[PDB]
Assembly symmetry: D2
């Protein structure tokens, strides 16, 4: 019913938080975006978050956001689950974005707790209750960005709603175990923990940044059983990706791989030259064929980069 | 002018009151600002966190700033909260706020979508040039501390009025001892910041309730007894994240309707009972409005998501 | 190429300018809307204009507009051609709406010349040139509403662009003939002329209001050859529909037929009581089975009607 | 007050000038308004058709009104164009315009999506109560005449200041003889309307160019010779739909940049040559700005769709 739709989200192991690429004037580069999503599908990504933090949703106008979701459903909705990031620190915005995203056929919603303008436990519950009934929902707990832990009592209460698909959890393995042991579906939101969460702590899978770069490896990591060697091989890449706040790393890497133009909407700027040289090295160690795109990786010069505040 | 901002000691982060349908209650808002002016508030932040700026549409945001300037601009400095975690938004909001004649802008570092030091600087540089700016460091909400090196660099811009600082007295002192203007962002620390650490003043929530006392606290010299008298009120206000407390208190005082834009909801019954007690201990005449304080029933509160 | 897509629009004979139904609080009633579109499909409507004048596009927020298009493509795009009304008297708006509507998978755009803020012939050309390249486009000439005839020299110039599908023409049969005789595809925008335009003046078909009520009859009228008797039978209905400006009639009729709630976004208000009584009579003469819905037609009381300015 | 609006004789429908990137040129805009004030314009419509209101975003619309009020509100009456063919939009724009302190609203009947007489009345009734309102009848643009019966009914509302009428002198006289304030909306008829038909004044495009002359025309009594002197300039201005002419002329006079938001484009070269001639016949000192009038090349013009 609504049951089957929620179940469809719950069964996904590899969800890519897809990067939004830009044209030199700062508008969406839909061609490059379409290529990224095709690559994700071809390498076994089962879902995509559209316009999340990795996708710089907070930098979009609301129409762009609604357009990108609609676009993703229309082009790829039969080949991958499309999960719109329709959350907000404003309940009103979360309501409208969520209903519009479902009306347009997205398969689920990702909902963060109100950040910056944080609220009480009662308010957080009230917030989630306005959107939980609209369709399959992933609750996103990322206290390092929201500055407010979504406590277990909120998660467990929400999980009585059949539309609550599960949790993107970033607090760690202990918090993951706490939920999975009670049968709540958890996706790890931390690339560098998702192997252990998957195989040691009952996590269903990952909502991933790293899969933007190496979707095949991330798929292996989530499906083919424990593999501490593969996990260790990815760690330097993951450390490189998160040395500045996401999505600064993935934006830089995808430019370097030639699959997105070197165009940044502020307030994001690329990793400096020395870090770009590091990246070339990491690609060589892991093998360029494992990374998205066909073009030889480039370091890029500082002045290849376009930084835009007005677009 | 920047110097005009720099000399302010009492800036109120004004609450935005609502009509039962969720729209702004301009009449109540006007009354709150008048009350602030009458009791010596020298500035107002319009549509900051206390003002629930993040729940406004952009037009309501621009309208409220313009409205405040038109009605009160000759009587109080009007500082628009025109910041955002989006550089594009901050740019547009700031230049529109200035074009409407606001006296200054309050800019936070990008929250949630946090960036690098270089990205933070870039962000600030797109707006700092547009007019007098207060930089807002509130790491407990942004989850990213604006480091001293950033502040010192921004302070070379003559449009940088100063810092609303929340880290504490040591960070306050680090700036004020270098002649950087600081307003404390923490009501429960602002007395000590003001008299012991060189802070110019406070950007205050508590002044929404007791503007007279907060004025005394900032102008009339050290007074640890007044400070101690206010602490229970401050502790009550901040037991849930601002502005839940001030929203609840202003409803209880009868100066704002009991109408909350989600995701905020009022303090529970027992806390409202506590509030009535605190008003009696401090004395009702010190709190905004004339109406006898009420406890209110839970069903008095309107919680709105669609407005 | 782009050729095939334009050709797909050109081959449509029955395009319904679909009414947008509302809930009592003034929001879209997507359930009722979905039922209307299903009815249109089941009775041989081949295309739908989403958010045109009949659909009260001018009363929508931009996100609602983008949402409705995306929604229509997602739910019905495989069963009917979805033509977004993405035009505007503002070139900037027309540009954004058009590209967003195409990104979301709509099959064509309907573009009016700038109304109210009318421009020169040169400006009208410049306006159309910004959006013509984005995909299959129907140019809409309705001088009775725009207060500015799109002259033949503009139409003929635009028709050199392979994305120009054809014209929704309202000036009349002579203007229709002028274009069709040169091989330009024309849809009549006047229900009470579309039979003659179709069979006597080379028009491909109709972009229709009346088909909201009697889709089967309108389909017959456009496919099954000349039929002056059927045409005469529909005339009283069409006269009733247009006695106040569209969409006042169709909003009233659909309420009366029980397929849309009696909810009007201002500045539209329903036809008065005596006209609603007339409508019941017209349904009886033509036969209720020919009209959309299953519910017995009602007159409705004045106070069944909800009129909303704030929604 | 409504009476304050009613007494205005010269209202300029002010042009909105642009920067090369398509954004508002506030500096040039401020200069245009100053010039209007200096030469006796008593009101300004902000973001009407001449002001290309239909090309603005809603925030730019709200910002420009607020800006005009803040900068010029003490020196000139500011009438926001807050109307729309959407009742919801008109409601929001009007109440936000008033909250920002505009003196009046100009409301058109719903155009393009035209409605019934009853719908038109309903539309007007949602906004008339909010403050002093000028009702705008321009059937050549709306494709729907506001009938006298509608005007007479609205005129019972004390907030109805009057009518900007474009139908002609007979319609003007029909209202003014009943003591309804009318401003002519047709520059080439406003002299006769003013002196022969009881019109109070003009809501003018031509005053953007020659504000001094338009003032004389409205205040200093019948002057068929001045009227005849202006007619060639008026005929030039309106050979393409307003504001194509005024946009072109202000670019030629050097007081606005040659930047057009689509779907407007400038008059062709030969018309710009005509313009230079008309300026010489009338005398350059009568036209806004100090710069010698230029013809400009076609490639001087920036046409923008994405701004
Ligand atoms: C994704 O969620 C949202 C996206 C956009 C909005 C925009 C609004 S709300 C409103 O009334 N106005 C007009 C005004 O306030 O004047 C807006 O433009 C609200 C929610
Ligand atoms: C105030 O702190 C809390 C209050 C309530 C809870 C709720 C819990 S804990 C748990 O495992 N389950 C599932 C079960 O036991 O079936 C819950 O629903 C947690 C924290
Ligand atoms: C080397 O790094 C940079 C050097 C210069 C810039 C300049 C920018 S970015 C932006 O939004 N604006 C405002 C505007 O474009 O109006 C600028 O001036 C950015 C980065
Ligand atoms: C406070 O600053 C801002 C407020 C609103 C915006 C929104 C924009 S910009 C643009 O082009 N569009 C149309 C579209 O992208 O569909 C928008 O809706 C940007 C900045
Ligand atoms: C369908 O086409 C459009 C829909 C919406 C827009 C909205 C705009 S444009 C812009 O800059 N801003 C922010 C500001 O101006 O502050 C907006 O909100 C433009 C086009
Ligand atoms: C200034 O008036 C006009 C100027 C040019 C035209 C263009 C025409 S007329 C016609 O039939 N065709 C097709 C053809 O002849 O192949 C045209 O392209 C019409 C009016
Ligand atoms: C019998 O016909 C009618 C009777 C009363 C109304 C009232 C309305 S409609 C609207 O927008 N507003 C403004 C608001 O709701 O704020 C009203 O007061 C409409 C029609
Ligand atoms: C000038 O008056 C208006 C200006 C803008 C609006 C836009 C609105 S209202 C609303 O809810 N939303 C969000 C949504 O519908 O997605 C909007 O964008 C309405 C009136
Ligand atoms: Cl692989
Ligand atoms: Cl308001
Ligand atoms: Cl006191
Ligand atoms: Cl049939
Ligand atoms: Cl501006
Ligand atoms: Cl003069």
């Amino acid at each position: 019913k609504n049951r089957t739709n929620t179940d469809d989200i719950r069964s996904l192991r590899v969800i890519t938080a897809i990067k939004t690429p830009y044209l030199p004037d700062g508008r969406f580069d839909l061609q490059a975006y379409d290529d990224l999503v095709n690559t994700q599908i071809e390498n076994g990504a089962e879902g995509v978050i559209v316009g999340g933090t990795t996708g710089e949703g907070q930098l979009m106008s609301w129409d762009e956001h609604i357009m990108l979701i609609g676009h993703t459903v229309n082009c790829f909705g039969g080949r991958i689950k499309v999960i719109g990031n329709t959350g907000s620190n404003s309940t009103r915005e979360a309501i409208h974005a969520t209903e519009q995203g479902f009306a347009m056929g997205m398969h689920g919603a990702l909902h963060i707790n109100p950040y910056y303008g944080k609220t009480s436990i009662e308010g957080m519950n009230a917030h989630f209750q306005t959107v939980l009934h609209m369709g399959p929902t992933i609750i996103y707990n990322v206290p390092g960005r929201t500055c407010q832990d979504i406590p277990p009592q909120v998660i467990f209460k929400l999980s009585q709603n059949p539309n609550m698909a599960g949790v993107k959890e970033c607090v760690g393995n202990n918090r993951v175990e706490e939920y999975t042991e009670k049968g709540i579906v958890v996706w790890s939101g931390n690339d560098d923990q998702c192997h252990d969460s998957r195989w040691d702590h009952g996590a269903t899978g990952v909502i991933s940044v790293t899969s933007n770069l190496v979707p095949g490896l991330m798929r292996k990591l989530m499906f083919e059983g424990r593999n501490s060697a593969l996990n260790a091989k990815l760690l330097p890449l993951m450390d490189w990706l998160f040395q500045e706040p996401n999505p600064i790393g993935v934006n830089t890497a995808l430019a370097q791989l030639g699959v997105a133009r070197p165009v940044f909407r502020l307030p994001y700027v690329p990793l400096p030259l020395s870090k770009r040289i590091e990246f070339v090295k990491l690609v060589k160690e892991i093998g360029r064929e494992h990374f998205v795109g066909d073009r030889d990786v480039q370091v890029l010069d500082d002045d290849d980069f376009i930084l835009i505040g007005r677009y």
